[PDB]
């Protein structure tokens, strides 16, 4: 089986870090992504093609070019960035309004849980207003890219969504 995943979120959220932790099993250095990275991750007999798309504000208008055929969205949030959590919500809701993503499922990663004052998954749920989403299957998972904690639990959820049609 296959699943096309679009992974977006504000710049510095940790997307590229997550992509290569999944693909290569390690934390590698990154630079802010101008454009995208794409890798296929084989997991539970599913080939997940994951599109890691840059989140600097200057290139957010490009996110729309990646919506077509997307089956799962991974929206990555810096759990320690209280100053920009609402900005993340604004981008998330703006993207969810799009018809091309009507049938996409949503996995939110509350990332950087290793940081001393990181907001937990429940707080991020509240701040993003996820409970208000309609006609959408969604899940939130706390993650730490370094240890890898939460990453495969996220893929497990996506996998179960695909399996149940």
């Amino acid at each position: 089986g296959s699943m096309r995943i679009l992974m977006v979120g504000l710049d510095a959220a940790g997307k590229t870090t997550i992509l290569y932790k999944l693909k290569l099993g390690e934390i590698v250095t990154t630079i802010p992504t101008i454009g995208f990275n794409v890798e296929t991750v084989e997991y539970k007999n599913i080939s997940f093609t994951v599109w890691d798309v840059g989140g600097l504000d200057k290139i957010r208008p490009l996110w729309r070019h990646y919506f077509q055929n997307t089956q799962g969205l991974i929206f990555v949030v810096d759990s320690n960035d209280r100053e920009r959590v609402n900005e993340a919500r604004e981008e998330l809701m703006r993207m969810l309004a799009e018809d091309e993503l009507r049938d996409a499922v949503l996995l939110v990663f509350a990332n950087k849980q290793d940081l001393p004052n990181a907001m937990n998954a429940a707080e991020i749920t509240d701040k993003l207003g996820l409970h208000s989403l309609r006609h959408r299957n969604w899940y939130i998972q706390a993650t730490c890219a370094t240890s890898g904690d939460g990453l495969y639990e996220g893929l497990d959820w996506l996998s179960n969504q695909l399996r149940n049609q």
């Binding site: 101008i34 454009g35 995208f36 794409v38 200057k58 290139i59 490009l62 070019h65 990646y66 077509q68």
Partner: protein, 41 residues
């Protein structure tokens, strides 16, 4: 940066293509456009 509708159409078709060369082209196109915009500052 991306106001030119025609360049946007080129970018959109490359990003939605199944051909690996098109995807490489798109990725470079985005960097060029950003870099050119960085110029002209």
């Amino acid at each position: 940066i991306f106001e030119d509708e025609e360049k946007s159409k080129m970018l959109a078709r490359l990003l939605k293509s199944s051909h690996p060369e098109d995807l490489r082209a798109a990725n470079k196109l985005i960097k060029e456009m950003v870099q050119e915009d960085q110029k002209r500052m």
